[PDB]
Ligand binder design. Sequence first.
Ligand SMILES: CO[C@@H]1O[C@H](CO)[C@H](O)[C@H](O)[C@H]1O
Ligand SMILES: CO[C@@H]1O[C@H](CO)[C@H](O)[C@H](O)[C@H]1O
Ligand SMILES: CO[C@@H]1O[C@H](CO)[C@H](O)[C@H](O)[C@H]1O
Ligand SMILES: CO[C@@H]1O[C@H](CO)[C@H](O)[C@H](O)[C@H]1O
Ligand SMILES: [Ca+2]
Ligand SMILES: [Ca+2]
Ligand SMILES: [Ca+2]
Ligand SMILES: [Ca+2]
Ligand SMILES: [Mn+2]
Ligand SMILES: [Mn+2]
Ligand SMILES: [Mn+2]
Ligand SMILES: [Mn+2]
Lengths: 232, 232, 232, 232
Amino acid sequence: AETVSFNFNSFSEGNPAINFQGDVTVLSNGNIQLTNLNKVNSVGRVLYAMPVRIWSSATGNVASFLTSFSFEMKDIKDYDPADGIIFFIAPEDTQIPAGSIGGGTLGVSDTKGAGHFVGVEFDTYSNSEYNDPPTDHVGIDVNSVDSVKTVPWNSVSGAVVKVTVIYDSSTKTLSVAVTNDNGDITTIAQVVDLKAKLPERVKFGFSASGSLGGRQIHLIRSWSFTSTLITT
Amino acid sequence: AETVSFNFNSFSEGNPAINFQGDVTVLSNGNIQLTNLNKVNSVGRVLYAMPVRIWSSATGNVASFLTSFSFEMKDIKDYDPADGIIFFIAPEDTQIPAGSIGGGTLGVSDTKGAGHFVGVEFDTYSNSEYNDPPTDHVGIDVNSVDSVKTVPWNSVSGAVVKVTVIYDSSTKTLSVAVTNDNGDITTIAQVVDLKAKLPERVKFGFSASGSLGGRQIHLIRSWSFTSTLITT
Amino acid sequence: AETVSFNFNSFSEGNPAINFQGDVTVLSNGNIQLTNLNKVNSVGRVLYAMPVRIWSSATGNVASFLTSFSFEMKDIKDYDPADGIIFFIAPEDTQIPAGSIGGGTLGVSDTKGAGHFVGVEFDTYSNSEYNDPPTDHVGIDVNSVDSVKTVPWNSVSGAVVKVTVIYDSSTKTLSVAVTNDNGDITTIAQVVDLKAKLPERVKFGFSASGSLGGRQIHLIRSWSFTSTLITT
Amino acid sequence: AETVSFNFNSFSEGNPAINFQGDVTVLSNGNIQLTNLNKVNSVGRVLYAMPVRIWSSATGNVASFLTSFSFEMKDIKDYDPADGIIFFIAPEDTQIPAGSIGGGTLGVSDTKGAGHFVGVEFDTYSNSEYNDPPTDHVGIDVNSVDSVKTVPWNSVSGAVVKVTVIYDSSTKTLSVAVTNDNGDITTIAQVVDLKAKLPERVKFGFSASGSLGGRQIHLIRSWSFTSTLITT
Ligand SMILES: CO[C@@H]1O[C@H](CO)[C@H](O)[C@H](O)[C@H]1O
Ligand SMILES: CO[C@@H]1O[C@H](CO)[C@H](O)[C@H](O)[C@H]1O
Ligand SMILES: CO[C@@H]1O[C@H](CO)[C@H](O)[C@H](O)[C@H]1O
Ligand SMILES: CO[C@@H]1O[C@H](CO)[C@H](O)[C@H](O)[C@H]1O
Ligand SMILES: [Ca+2]
Ligand SMILES: [Ca+2]
Ligand SMILES: [Ca+2]
Ligand SMILES: [Ca+2]
Ligand SMILES: [Mn+2]
Ligand SMILES: [Mn+2]
Ligand SMILES: [Mn+2]
Ligand SMILES: [Mn+2]
């Protein structure tokens, strides 16, 4: 079997295993701050440097994975807490969209909200142009920020949130479990054929964005991942 | 929302939060040993004392849950390592089947392998009478030990295994991620409508069994659980 | 360590984790109203269903706990605002006293004011037969409503009151911090050996009562609790 | 009554309500980092600017207070995680000791471990010269880092810890409740006569320190406080 696994309790700038793109910054406490609070239409993204092979054209197998991470979003004075964080999977050549308006595109799509990626979003702002639900929410995105499926959620300022994601190759099911600060959990699952939406080699990472009037702190505190592809 | 959550790093006999049924024993190290190595057709089960309400007839909602636990199986001299452990959900009145033959019924079904429960089994013995696969395996069981779906696996003696289970109420999907000793992960997912197979109030627990010639150590080391039911 | 913890932001009738005794009712907003405004000598009690083990006869250890809750008392027309709320700890078999006269017994003691419990009372009526102080007050009760110790307080109609309680096993000190509507805090502490007054297994809950002429609204809005017993 | 209350969800440099002393730094996420990871014998302290009157020479009363705060300690590469954090109360003229060696003095005492303060310490290093216990611990300090009383504890890297403290004027009891990451709580209480150890006006704050080889991240995330002195 082909297995890739890593664990980050703290991040550091200069670690060859991580790729920073945009306004990403590494705080003294090891946390990653994705956006710059003083920039208009800010966008920051962090990726695992090494491309992971999620499927083989030789065998036809797709890999399974288990990943968990914790994040924190916090309100800043005078600005609307926006726009949110997104865990995504994209081709190995992925770069922040050219002329990115930040904001509701979460730093992964164009102005229409289209792009080439698959991901789970923790959206803290209702963008009517992308058909966002009227409340904070978690959603499964397949090549667009106009979510395929969403579920009501609640973002608490200064709260450490924990997430666990499981992808089962056989059923092609992607399920997420979000453990809120108060103990409550929120789940969402959707069938996504990674083999038909993405290429053999891909990169995993997080992205966040803001606008002119919408800004807040987007922190990534830890991240562990394991994937296994049956090579036979 | 209605949330139930608990965390067990070590177990102790005398804790009103746990129900012991059968040959269950609590070791000095805080571990739970499910079966008795000196008994024929031994059976031991441990349940969370408080019944959890997984669905409401009033609203029609089903709860979502996230649970993780670690176990260990170890070979003993002269006996075949059998038969395995099973994480199950059953009605609040659940008791070890009358005249239980232990063995391949995992302590949850009658001789035909039928019963009233939903669970995930870590089977270390191929019982042809229940249509078991020819190797160790993980399987989803709905009211029977003749698994609805299974996936090849490998039980390593003396190895601590970790499991994470997510049930999404919306899709009614139950997904499991098993992290082996060597780092590799095994997953299996299946759609199970809990509202149609079980009653409003249920109990969660683990069960293990042996036979005359099949016996091994079955240990439960830790267990954390959280469920949330939307009451609206 | 043996830890029991729960959190209630809202209560609902039908939740197996809660035991209702007496005139208790669950409002549409999730609050619990303890007494019935239309009944003479009304009494209502709510308990956490699962019995908690506060001490072990095996080791000799007593547990420590931290609990916080918020309540509201409101005046109704023509009736004297009485009699008050009481946070108590009693044996697992605890029931409203037979032939309870409600009133100044707070639904936990007999006519002489004796009973088997430990609790903190927020008394809004001076009952001279139980040697009550001449003003509203908070008191520590050990098997009697004739308080071991009391401190002047002031009950404000329609005001949300917050309370935090800490019990330190080592010193066997029980301290209470009451945060009034206007910001001021009131505290009271007393040494109470739980191991000598109560049995190994107990139940936690609140109780309220009224009389013929004394009636008012008694609301419980939220409640969180955590206890840890060192099992070694 | 005389009441002083404040609440900090995030800290900012430039807020006249806070006094920074030493290597204190305010991160972009609003957290306060007490020590400098690149300095030998680093020391950082933060105090509430306004002096609080804990007792009156006119009446003879002592104030009661309820305070809660959350912190985080994190391991850095190559350095021993030391030395810890301390919540303290000292005279209004309090300054970092002259020629402070940092380390085991927690930035509040001289080399002998003597000083003029009262506080609760979260010690992550056993300094034999101050008679420290052999494990991590919480302790009550009265004018010395050679704790009057301590209790075993465990510091988990990257874990958000919550603490609640209550001081009852009548009994002169100070009790602390520490809620660990895994849910368990730790408590410690001690009788301390504030009126005989400190002057009428004092200042509240936190302090942290490191040495040459001992360094780690010390963060203060939030802090709320309320004190009430009966003026009559
Ligand atoms: C006016 O633009 C909108 O501003 C919001 C905050 O107010 C969000 O950032 C949206 O993404 C953005 O489109
Ligand atoms: C006939 O006994 C069989 O023995 C095995 C070990 O050999 C297992 O325990 C099987 O369940 C049991 O059916
Ligand atoms: C005449 O009965 C009294 O009524 C009061 C209000 O007037 C309180 O309820 C007292 O407990 C009760 O003894
Ligand atoms: C010899 O210096 C010591 O270093 C330790 C870490 O190893 C701690 O910092 C002690 O306080 C300090 O006294
Ligand atoms: Ca949005
Ligand atoms: Ca079998
Ligand atoms: Ca009274
Ligand atoms: Ca020390
Ligand atoms: Mn969205
Ligand atoms: Mn099987
Ligand atoms: Mn009274
Ligand atoms: Mn110490």
